[PDB]
Design a protein around this ligand. Structure first.
Ligand SMILES: [Fe+2]
Ligand SMILES: [Fe+2]
Lengths: 296, 296
């Protein structure tokens, strides 16, 4: 523990657009009990996976990371204490809002905020998408998120050495792409695992207005993906990449712009990894085929 | 009885375009022993599946239909004689050229030419696509071909009642689509099977320049399809339909224009049918998702 991506909390300038998009494009289900004009989007037994709160910005607020139990959370505390990373225990009100038994809050060096928790409540009535797809979560958690970092070496240190994620994959970026002179060194996009899902987390050393590069959610079948593409097309959702399969996690997916300005990857067939045999290597292409990121 | 589609012979106005497309887009392999300036494209142990001969038009010449043995071919002779359909035995030169033991030649009432044969020679050196895909033939044969017909009822009688194909699916057209009065009767696109492949043959009662609406070839995996689409886009092959999944045969495929001006559907995951269970019904949509023919 940490074992998986639990939830994502984001701020939004357009709550109506997010509601229509989560319901009619993503085919998520609305959760009950929210604020004060906030939106809970459900994919499974979790009370909420995507929480959208109204605000003046379109940005990531926090990612919530689930541990197996009190001991698995304490292990994260002990790592943080060894590094000297400041953290706070959740207030009574934060525990009640998130519906978790314990949680700590802290930030990585680039100052992306984390909530690490255990003992979430679940809701048990069947979550049924009107479009007939089922999301793939379980032991792989919510999906995976790719976030901006200020410094890839620093991110590698905090996520692997401090937090204990595994390095799953790495891809180099030419120095020009990251605002470095043509004469100096490439920078690194690194993918991190906490469970069999190839990656739950990755860091792009390039800035974004939201802090999010992409959020991937996974469904069981290619037909689920293709039907989703059709719904997005009908609703004039702006496209970011055509259908394709990734090299590193073998995900078959397309990418589309959300109302928050970052991409959602809507995929299937994500590769599962066993840490006992996985060899961390450098991948040299994004995709095996498709995924034309010029489409936007 | 006829067991599968064996080969397709077409005439072409641009042999160089076909050789490049066959090799670099379809990833078929060139056969040997082709006559003067003809092109043999191979998918498997057949000496050729797609035969392209020089000519003044881009047009279907004949479809070759494989039977299991001499008795299977005689059963077709018997059916033709019962109907009063004229047919000719292949000459010595024709048997040698097609590399078959026996073959009869005749046409349907719309004038489409059939060559029904048994005892093909095979070639045994491995056929290796440079792109790494394997075609799906075997008991399913070469693929399927959708052809023009002048009269759907007469085609239904000839293919089902006379030749013994099974009716596999039907799709209705608005009377006005076939230039009838808008309060006239619908016409019918009918799909015919001779093996587990959902259909080997279908008839659109609408005219085409070549006689061909589409030729489908099948590969093992979605990645093979996705890779082919990238090759085709790179080579500026005209797209006819986006990636999608058909309703009737569940083929996951895209459509593209060949050098002959007709479409090839390049697909995977074709549905298998058992005649003991199969119910012949009317489908009311082309696709579950995708297959936007508006791109062409
Ligand atoms: Fe992803
Ligand atoms: Fe087809």
């Amino acid at each position: 523990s940490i074992r998986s991506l639990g939830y994502l909390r984001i701020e939004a300038t357009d709550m109506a657009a997010w509601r229509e998009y989560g319901l009619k494009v993503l085919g998520m289900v609305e959760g009950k009990g929210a604020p004060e004009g906030a939106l809970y989007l459900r994919m499974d037994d979790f009370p909420a996976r995507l929480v959208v709160v109204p605000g003046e910005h379109d940005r990531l607020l926090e990612a919530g990371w689930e541990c197996a139990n009190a001991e698995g959370l304490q292990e994260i505390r002990n790592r943080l204490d060894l590094e000297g990373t400041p953290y706070k225990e959740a207030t009574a009100a934060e525990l009640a809002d998130r519906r978790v038994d314990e949680m700590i809050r802290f930030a990585d060096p680039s100052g992306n905020c984390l909530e690490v928790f255990h003992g979430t409540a679940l809701e048990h009535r069947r979550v049924v998408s009107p479009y007939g797809h089922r999301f793939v979560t379980g032991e792989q958690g919510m999906g995976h998120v790719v976030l901006s970092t200020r410094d890839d070496a620093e991110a590698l240190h905090f996520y692997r050495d401090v937090l204990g994620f595994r390095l799953r994959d790495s891809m180099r970026l030419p120095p020009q792409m990251v605002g470095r002179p043509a004469d100096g060194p490439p920078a690194w996009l690194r993918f991190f695992g906490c469970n069999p899902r190839h990656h739950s987390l990755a860091f792009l050393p390039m800035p974004t207005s939201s802090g999010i590069v992409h959020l991937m959610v996974e469904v069981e079948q290619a037909d689920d993906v293709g039907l989703c593409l059709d719904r997005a097309l009908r609703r004039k959702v702006p496209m970011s990449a055509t259908l394709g399969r990734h090299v590193n996690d073998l995900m078959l997916s397309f990418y589309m712009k959300t109302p928050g300005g970052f991409d959602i990857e809507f995929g299937c067939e994500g590769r599962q990894v066993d840490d006992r045999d996985w060899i961390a290597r450098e991948s040299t292409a994004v995709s095996l085929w498709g995924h034309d990121f010029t489409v936007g």
